[PDB]
Design an enzyme around this catalytic site. Structure first.
Site, short mmCIF file in Angstrom:
data_model
loop_
_atom_site.label_atom_id
_atom_site.label_comp_id
_atom_site.label_asym_id
_atom_site.label_seq_id
_atom_site.Cartn_x
_atom_site.Cartn_y
_atom_site.Cartn_z
N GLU A 157 0.92 21.74 -2.13
CA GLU A 157 0.14 20.98 -3.34
C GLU A 157 0.37 22.02 -4.49
OE1 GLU A 157 -4.16 20.70 -3.41
OE2 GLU A 157 -4.22 19.17 -4.67
N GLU A 202 4.27 12.63 6.23
CA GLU A 202 4.95 11.89 5.47
C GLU A 202 5.12 12.38 4.02
OE1 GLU A 202 3.58 7.84 5.27
OE2 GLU A 202 4.94 7.44 3.76
N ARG A 260 -5.19 -0.10 -7.40
CA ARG A 260 -5.13 0.01 -5.97
C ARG A 260 -6.30 0.65 -5.44
NH1 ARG A 260 0.38 1.90 -2.75
NH2 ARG A 260 -0.62 2.02 -0.51
N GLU A 297 4.04 -9.61 5.43
CA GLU A 297 4.63 -10.29 4.36
C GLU A 297 5.81 -11.12 4.76
OE1 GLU A 297 6.47 -7.52 1.81
OE2 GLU A 297 8.35 -8.87 1.36
N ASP A 317 -2.73 6.41 -0.02
CA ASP A 317 -1.97 6.54 1.34
C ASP A 317 -1.22 8.11 1.71
OD1 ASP A 317 -0.07 5.69 3.32
OD2 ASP A 317 1.66 5.32 2.05
#
Lengths: 674, 674
Positions: free
Chosen positions: B505, B387, B330, B282, B359
């Site tokens: 989770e 992450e 997406r 970007e 992701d």
């Protein structure tokens, strides 16, 4: 050349608006007087195209501008005889039928400096000066600007470029500093802290011989413009740079260390203003680290500065609390922690309190601390940099809001106990008190990022000098000096400034609940951004209603921090002002406001309509094309377009969030994305 | 000394578990063989307290361990005769009735290296090696580790300390690199990219003479352990460091520049692996900047590497979209952009695709791209660094999840078209393909931040070698080698690892909708964190229901990207698996799952119960005190306590958010803060 002159344009007048002066009588030669004379010469040369000779004795037959203090006068007239404030001054035209003479009489040199800027202001405004009779004395003793500049060049919450003071952990090699001083002095600002209140590694050294020489030359410049210099300090300095094992204010050695530090500073800066302090921090030892209270922490530093006349600007910073506990209220913290300490602070300690009890939100009720500590000096801080008010992308003239705060009657001593009387020291006879503003400037050519944000710096100074000035006249002064006297330009830009705050509030947080901003950088909509954080900034919106219950009857009991008159107004659901309703009450979305709107419909209304109002700002600005220089015209248009686009985002994010939660559609059927 | 040996402890065996060997027959002297012999000597010395002499010819009467390739053999037996993979090997005990001989036969030197680590693994596990008959060949040709290390020492999404490769924009002055290589090689990893795929200023120079010498010595070490070195590159290099005016892949000069760059690299590194690439960005020009597609962008680099045998690892990175538009998805982007390009990529280009289309969320359905491009090499990336899975604060053994992905049948060629067959190249006969994992290591003494996260690195290697290995045996191997064979220790730590993912989770995002994390750092609960962002990561929770409608019938039509069998399963509200329901359907909170729970009650259940399960993890660990060394026992306990406390926050934030929105109370009356 590299930056705008802001409101000190001194634009050349036409052939029919000039003055005839042959001499400038400077009765003194002090550094301040030299700066004063230079300013007068610059203004008269640029505006009038005249270059009067500077002399020290009046020429009986020459048209002159006389500069001096009462002591320099031959015939001390009555008017100037009433002056009691050191920074006060008088300006009067000689009533003789001979030569034209203007007398600028100040109580002290500083008074003459402010008088000259006032005289120059009249000229820029095109006022008739044939028969002047003016007397002015500032209401606030301390009229300060606080910088959040870091020495690496960054500015915490700075949206107008990098620091003009530091770069690469050093001082910049000073013409812009002089012009900055000129700007500040033009609006009466007499004090400034040059470094971030959040003092980091390199900045901690500003109080050592390594940097004091540089701090001193910066202070030398500010002094010539009647500005006293302050430094923000790291409470843990004794440890970090003093080689001591503790920072405990009661530790004998720590106390000695600060006294020696103060002594050292004054050797470089004889008139050093003092320290701006944020005492506990989360990564370094502070008063609380050793179980000491704010008085013990502040008084230790005050004692170190006392022999030199320095002042301690103590930030009333009281971090995590649990969002689960609705009994705990961040809004109550400041008052609960400092109110009990009233009377325990040394005389040269001034508690710095934000206009509101939370953190510079678009709208916040007034900090209850104002009016609650008759035995403790208090100074209000406002934020010129637009952290939560558009970050200079969205237009937001903050003067109207500051006036609402200053004119708020605390009823501390009955009717007529407005905040302004508290901070100007008249209500409680405070030895030292006033107002401070967090700087909105940076390295950008236009100084403030948004050209029109120059009005907030100018406006802060005007209010600091005299809170009784109207927002309308302040806006008028700034527009005329900055863009000229074209009737359309003046009326249009003034309307834009005066309407901006309300417009921005319309599409941001509703009814004074505040926040609803993205975490971290704080720019843009994010209704739940901090809703579940440990920052105590919650709106409690659920499927049925929204708001914080701060009532004594069923809530946190925050209303009780105000005096009876205001406590009752906010306590009652039917008397609480709409604009602050959600800050004080948790109500159903169907609750009907004084405006007749339900809380939910009000949200939709102000958000849809706020965007349309923003579009109007741009439209009105576009109509001025050709009457403003291309550079500034486009600089502002670019920002207004950015504002419009972002406003659309604020509008939709907020409307969708509340539709998704309330399930109640927009009365007028406007577009709400599901 | 400064760091743990992880699973290569080679702990000293008791007097009843030793082996008698007098010699090690090393048939070759290549750098790999020297490393192999050193490893065998180290393992046998530490475990068995024996120091067999290293020779090049077998001693007919000595107990020996023979090391060599088929070519070094005297009598090539049938078993090793079936070896076809270059990295394959055979281990067999001589069936003679005389001296004890172990034969480690590899197809190539690399095969011998992996065979020795397998042999050493058997020893650490205490397996009977009296009659071994083993043949092993890796399923995936490329078994890679991707580093997100920056040269300033930071690691993007690194939760285990600073880079072990760089510091102060330079390379660290290499013993830890050797031990790291040993660890990677022990689990079969044969490729590594040493720098962040997001290439910054200094890192761009890794492909120049200024840094190539250092990159080369790092590559020299990895080579001795059968590991090929890769560099992430800045697509705009021709501009930034090449002095060219464009980065356009079709520009004749740009193409030449990359060829010369490749040639230059191979002069320093003859067996250089290739480039890892994230092509548009970007802030810098990329293929799209010039209107070129991914094939044109990737093929240009492939052509530069082709003469040298290099490979292009192309990140399938397709940023803002509007949250208002529910037609845009997406999740559909990757497939929509690359599927049409199938067959247009050069043979040495490998598309790197994440396990999921979003992701690395705690749970995501499988990327539809796997099985959809029979003419394009594909490599799956998984994320070892946690992450979105606890950032090594919360325990999360990722092997079970990766197996669910690998065993997912795409039905690309009918039943039996699992992802693992796609990426191991067998299904479509891919020339180059495999799997990659984003490194979870750092400078921390325990390498991975959380001691037990060492299992994720070990486990990644095991699966990369053979996806058919069970999570149970992988966990068993790691626990035994790292903490010993005590029955309780093994059973307990294994249970902890195997249950961890589901537990995490349980108290994070529900039913595969993902996200609900704090923006920026991505750690912790924030249900609406990105709900109104331009990242296309939305759950659409409102007062009535939640979920993303990705159906063809009424939604984004994402289900159609899968083959018929899976498309239909997800498309239907009644057949869609509960665990992924909210990723594929938007349903009312009252919708009843296959489990019998309503969607809202399921949310409460897993969140309350997840915390109790986390408490159990800690309890079970505490019961092992005395059976684990104090240092590691406390290192893990500290983390488990941090996990428990944070889990409570995840539980409450999520439960409160959904109670506030749904208005539906917890069936079991557990504590939900209003």
């Amino acid at each position: 050349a590299g930056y705008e002159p802001c409101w000190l344009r001194y634009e050349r007048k036409d052939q029919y608006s000039r003055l005839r002066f042959e001499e400038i009588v400077a009765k003194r030669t002090s550094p301040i007087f030299q700066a004063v004379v230079e300013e007068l010469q610059k203004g008269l040369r640029s505006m009038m195209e005249i270059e009067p000779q500077v002399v020290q004795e009046v020429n009986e037959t020459a048209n002159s501008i006389w500069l001096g203090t009462l002591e320099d006068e031959e015939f001390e007239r009555p008017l100037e005889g009433t002056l009691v404030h050191p920074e006060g001054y008088v300006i009067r035209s000689d009533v003789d039928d001979g030569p034209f003479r203007i007398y600028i009489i100040g109580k002290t040199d500083a008074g003459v400096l402010y008088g000259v800027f006032h005289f120059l202001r009249l000229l820029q405004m095109g006022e008739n000066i044939a028969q002047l009779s003016i007397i002015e004395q500032p209401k606030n003793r301390l009229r300060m600007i606080n910088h959040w500049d870091n020495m690496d060049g960054s500015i915490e919450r700075g949206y107008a470029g990098r620091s003009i003071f530091f770069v690469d952990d050093q001082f910049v090699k000073n013409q812009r500093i002089k012009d900055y001083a000129r700007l500040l002095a033009s609006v009466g600002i007499n004090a400034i802290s040059i470094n971030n209140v959040n003092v980091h590694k390199t900045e901690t050294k500003l109080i050592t011989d390594h940097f004091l020489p540089d701090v001193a030359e910066v202070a030398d410049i500010f002094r010539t413009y009647g500005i006293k210099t302050f430094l923000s300090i790291n409470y843990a300095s004794p440890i970090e740079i003093g080689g001591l094992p503790t920072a405990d204010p009661l530790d004998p050695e720590v106390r000695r260390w600060w006294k020696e530090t103060a002594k050292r500073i004054y050797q470089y800066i004889p008139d050093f203003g003092g320290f701006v302090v944020k005492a506990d921090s989360e990564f370094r030892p502070g008063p609380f680290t050793y179980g000491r209270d704010h008085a013990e922490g502040a008084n230790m530093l005050a004692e170190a500065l006392a022999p030199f006349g320095g002042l301690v600007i103590w930030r009333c910073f009281v971090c995590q609390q649990d969002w689960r506990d609705r009994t705990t209220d961040r809004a109550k913290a400041a008052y609960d922690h400092f109110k009990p300490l009233d009377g325990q602070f040394r005389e040269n300690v001034i508690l710095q309190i934000k206009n509101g009890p939370m953190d510079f939100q678009v709208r916040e009720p007034v900090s209850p601390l104002f009016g609650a500590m008759p035995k403790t000096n208090q100074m209000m801080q406002v934020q010129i940099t637009q952290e939560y008010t558009g970050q200079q992308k969205h237009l937001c003239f903050l003067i109207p809001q500051w006036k609402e705060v200053l004119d708020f009657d605390t009823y501390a001593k009955g009717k007529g106990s407005e905040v302004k009387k508290v901070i100007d020291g008249s209500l409680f006879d405070y030895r030292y008190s006033g107002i401070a503003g967090v700087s909105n400037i940076g390295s950008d050519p236009n100084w403030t990022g948004h050209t029109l944000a120059q009005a907030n710096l100018y406006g802060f100074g005007r209010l600091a000098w005299n809170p009784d000035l109207s927002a309308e006249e302040i806006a008028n002064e700034w527009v005329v000096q900055t863009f000229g006297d074209d009737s359309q330009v003046v009326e249009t830009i003034s309307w834009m400034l005066l309407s901006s705050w309300r417009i921005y509030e319309n599409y941001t947080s509703p009814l004074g609940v505040g926040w609803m901003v993205n975490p971290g950088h704080h720019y843009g909509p994010n209704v739940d951004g901090y809703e579940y954080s440990h920052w105590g900034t919650y709106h409690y919106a659920d499927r049925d209603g929204i708001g914080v219950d701060r009532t004594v009857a069923t809530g946190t009991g925050y209303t009780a921090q105000y005096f009876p008159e205001n406590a009752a107004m906010y306590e009652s659901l039917d008397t609480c002002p709409d604009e602050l309703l959600l800050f004080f009450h948790h109500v159903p979305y169907t609750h009907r406001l004084h405006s007749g709107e339900t809380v939910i419909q009000h949200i939709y209304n102000t958000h849809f309509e706020g965007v349309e109002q923003a579009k109007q700002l741009r439209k009105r600005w576009e109509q001025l094309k050709g009457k403003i220089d291309e550079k500034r015209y486009h600089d502002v248009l670019e920002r207004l377009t950015i504002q419009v686009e972002h406003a659309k985002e604020w509008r939709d994010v907020i409307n969708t969030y509340f539709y998704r939660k309330s399930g109640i559609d927009d009365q007028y059927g406007r577009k709400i994305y599901r």
